[PDB]
Amino acid sequence: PDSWDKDVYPEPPRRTPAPAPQTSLPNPVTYLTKIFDLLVDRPVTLAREFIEQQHAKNRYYYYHREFRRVPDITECEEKDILCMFEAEMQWRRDYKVDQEIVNIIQERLKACQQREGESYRQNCAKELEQFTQVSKAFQDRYSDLGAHYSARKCLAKQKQRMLAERKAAKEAAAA
Amino acid sequence: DGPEKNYEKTMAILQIEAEKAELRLKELEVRRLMRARGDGPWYQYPTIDKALIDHSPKTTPDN
């Protein structure tokens, strides 16, 4: 279906074997599938076609809201409450977007693990690597902020991490 | 209503409260300085009026 983009939610080509009846004994699966199709799928398909043709007679649209970019907390004055408010709201929106990104990666991981069957440990290495990278980035970004998180606290955490890594790099280079 | 209404109402409210807080701090500092020094209109305790003094010969030259 075109409701969701295929690139963001990738799916393998799902190759399937062909029926190779070894014996002449009629399998009940095919007969049951045929009758189920006949007296279930047809009425459902007709009802859906009726509903869709009713929908087509009255069509209207809804749009995705686009948000402008605003200065971050890094270029916000000490006590300028308005710029602080704008930066804080922007940071909250970015936080929600990052959470949904992690959710998407987790969904892909779970789908791959279930799809690959008994060889999930091997065939979904790429998904596990992507989840590991995204999880480490998210943990570095937003973890340990506390219940009363805010843009200032995240910025302070980033500054402390930058000091730690700069000191480590300087010590390594000067060694 | 739309989100812009709440957004801008919150911005106006934040401006009002920030201004009030700064004004309160300034008032406290001004009061402290004025009471410590006494060179402003506030905390002007009364003194003896000088219009009550009599400037006339006093039956004795040395006042």
Side-chain angles (χ1 to χ4, degrees):
Chain A
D2 204 42
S3 61
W4 80 90
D5 164 273
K6 255 66 166 159
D7 266 316
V8 57
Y9 307 107
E11 281 269 39
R14 59 144 272 184
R15 56 215 200 103
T16 172
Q22 196 98 51
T23 166
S24 82
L25 203 30
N27 48 359
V29 159
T30 55
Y31 183 61
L32 281 173
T33 300
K34 264 183 271 163
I35 167 154
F36 165 86
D37 279 9
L38 207 168
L39 88 184
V40 172
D41 199 323
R42 214 201 51 211
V44 167
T45 312
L46 271 63
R48 184 56 175 171
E49 283 178 353
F50 171 82
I51 287 176
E52 286 178 355
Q53 93 167 36
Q54 283 307 120
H55 289 180
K57 299 190 196 303
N58 164 322
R59 188 144 283 285
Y60 50 67
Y61 312 95
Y62 85 98
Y63 319 101
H64 171 97
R65 184 182 278 278
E66 315 276 355
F67 274 135
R68 204 170 300 129
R69 297 299 294 171
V70 278
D72 265 339
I73 207 71
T74 45
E75 56 255 23
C76 179
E77 217 68 38
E78 176 86 354
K79 285 323 169 58
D80 194 58
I81 200 60
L82 314 169
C83 188
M84 261 184 40
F85 172 69
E86 305 258 18
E88 181 74 24
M89 298 302 97
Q90 168 166 267
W91 184 84
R92 305 284 298 276
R93 277 176 261 118
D94 292 359
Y95 192 15
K96 277 198 281 190
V97 162
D98 285 23
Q99 284 169 7
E100 302 302 332
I101 280 171
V102 175
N103 277 339
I104 283 176
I105 302 305
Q106 284 185 354
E107 293 185 40
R108 304 204 314 199
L109 174 51
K110 302 195 274 216
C112 187
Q113 198 280 339
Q114 156 66 1
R115 180 195 309 113
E116 286 316 298
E118 200 64 32
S119 47
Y120 68 95
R121 185 48 69 200
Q122 158 151 359
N123 297 148
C124 300
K126 181 184 59 92
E127 270 89 331
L128 182 52
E129 182 59 35
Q130 287 175 86
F131 176 62
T132 304
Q133 166 213 39
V134 176
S135 160
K136 185 178 75 67
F138 190 94
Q139 176 155 21
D140 284 3
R141 267 190 176 202
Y142 301 109
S143 195
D144 276 4
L145 284 194
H148 293 285
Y149 48 68
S150 58
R152 301 173 40 203
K153 291 185 182 181
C154 189
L155 172 60
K157 181 184 186 183
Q158 166 170 1
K159 271 171 183 270
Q160 170 186 310
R161 171 157 47 75
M162 271 145 58
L163 294 185
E165 81 176 10
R166 176 185 86 176
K167 195 176 78 95
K170 185 182 151 124
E171 191 273 339
Chain B
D1 289 3
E4 39 286 47
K5 189 161 183 284
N6 197 46
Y7 204 79
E8 285 134 4
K9 275 153 53 63
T10 302
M11 274 215 310
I13 289 168
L14 285 182
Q15 165 166 65
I16 290 183
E17 311 286 350
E19 262 158 21
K20 281 205 269 214
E22 299 165 0
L23 279 173
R24 291 197 194 107
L25 268 307
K26 205 204 282 314
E27 191 218 340
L28 268 181
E29 187 48 354
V30 162
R31 284 182 58 168
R32 201 256 301 172
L33 286 175
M34 259 178 165
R35 205 191 180 122
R37 293 166 183 167
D39 46 19
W42 303 348
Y43 297 100
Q44 288 295 269
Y45 301 136
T47 47
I48 276 295
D49 192 6
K50 94 196 189 163
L52 291 173
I53 304 187
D54 193 28
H55 294 118
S56 300
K58 300 283 204 331
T59 88
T60 310
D62 307 338
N63 282 175

